[PDB]
Amino acid sequence: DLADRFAELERRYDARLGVYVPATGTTAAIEYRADERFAFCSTFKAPLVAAVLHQNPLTHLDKLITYTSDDIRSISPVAQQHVQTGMTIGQLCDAAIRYSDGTAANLLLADLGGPGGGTAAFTGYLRSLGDTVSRLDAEEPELNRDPPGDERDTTTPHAIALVLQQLVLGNALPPDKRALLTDWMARNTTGAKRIRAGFPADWKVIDKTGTGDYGRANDIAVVWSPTGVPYVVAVMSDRAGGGYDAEPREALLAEAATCVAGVLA
Numbered sequence: 001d002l003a004d005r006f007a008e009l010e011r012r013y014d015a016r017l018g019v020y021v022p023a024t025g026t027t028a029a030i031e032y033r034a035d036e037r038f039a040f041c042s043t044f045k046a047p048l049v050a051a052v053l054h055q056n057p058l059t060h061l062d063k064l065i066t067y068t069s070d071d072i073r074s075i076s077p078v079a080q081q082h083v084q085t086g087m088t089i090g091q092l093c094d095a096a097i098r099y100s101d102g103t104a105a106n107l108l109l110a111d112l113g114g115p116g117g118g119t120a121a122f123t124g125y126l127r128s129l130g131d132t133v134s135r136l137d138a139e140e141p142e143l144n145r146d147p148p149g150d151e152r153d154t155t156t157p158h159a160i161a162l163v164l165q166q167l168v169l170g171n172a173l174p175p176d177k178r179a180l181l182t183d184w185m186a187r188n189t190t191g192a193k194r195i196r197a198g199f200p201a202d203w204k205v206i207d208k209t210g211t212g213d214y215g216r217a218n219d220i221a222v223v224w225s226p227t228g229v230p231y232v233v234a235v236m237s238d239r240a241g242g243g244y245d246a247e248p249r250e251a252l253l254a255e256a257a258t259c260v261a262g263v264l265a
């Protein structure tokens with residue numbers, strides 16, 4: 001049973017694995033711990049970009065955001081090199097998705113506005129998509145500090161998969177905006193050893209990764225079959241039994257994805 005093989009992975013990596021592939025017209029759902037909470041980690045940066053796209057005309061992408069060295073409080077591979085010049089909103093969306101840029105994320109949260117530096121607004125966005133489970137309670141990097149059993153800054157594989165489904169493959173965004181989210185995810189630089197590593201070369205993979213404490217490693221993806229048939233793959237993992245500094249394990253996600261591709265191909 002596919003469920004039994006996921007349990008094999010949990011046992012072998014001493015991990016908790018959560019999987020959701022939504023059903024389609026020609027496939028069953030794949031569900032494993034799909035309604036258990038897992039930390040978002042950097043995965044929220046993809047729907048965050050969708051929020052900003054949703055809320056604004058595309059001309060907003062050209063708005064210049066200036067910030068300081070003092071705004072670099074989290075892993076920010078792009079923003080930390082542009083403190084002198086600032087970055088447009090479009091550049092931040094790019095950085096947030098393609099390089100998990102945590103300062104870009106923080107700036108895009110402030111862009112949504114309102115109490116919580118934008119965290120309330122973000123969660124509200126997910127609520128507008130039908131998601132009553134997910135919650136973002138802090139910015140980077142504090143949103144990573146939540147220990148197991150604290151529901152702050154968590155989602156479920158089921159919730160995040162269905163959010164991604166609506167954003168990339170559904171009608172949550174107008175198709176021009178959707179195209180952007182998709183293109184950015186298609187050119188991600190962080191995802192080569194996760195879901196991408198588990199799918200044959202003839203399948204297309206776009207994704208957004210996340211890594212945190214307690215061995216947290218997530219990847220959410222949209223994949224296209226050699227036929228052009230698209231599916232959403234959400235894979236979430238932690239290794240919390242090893243403590244706050246348990247090693248995150250990309251290969252766990254890669255194996256999970258391989259098992260998923262075996263079912264879908």
Ligand SMILES: O=C(O)C[C@@H]1CC[C@H](NC(=O)Cc2cccs2)B(O)O1
Nearest residue numbers: 041042075100190209210211212213
């Ligand atoms: O996209 C990825 O997979 C990596 C990305 C890096 C920035 C974010 N991590 C943090 O800010 C702190 C961290 C804890 C443990 C590792 S990095 B995010 O959650 O993950």
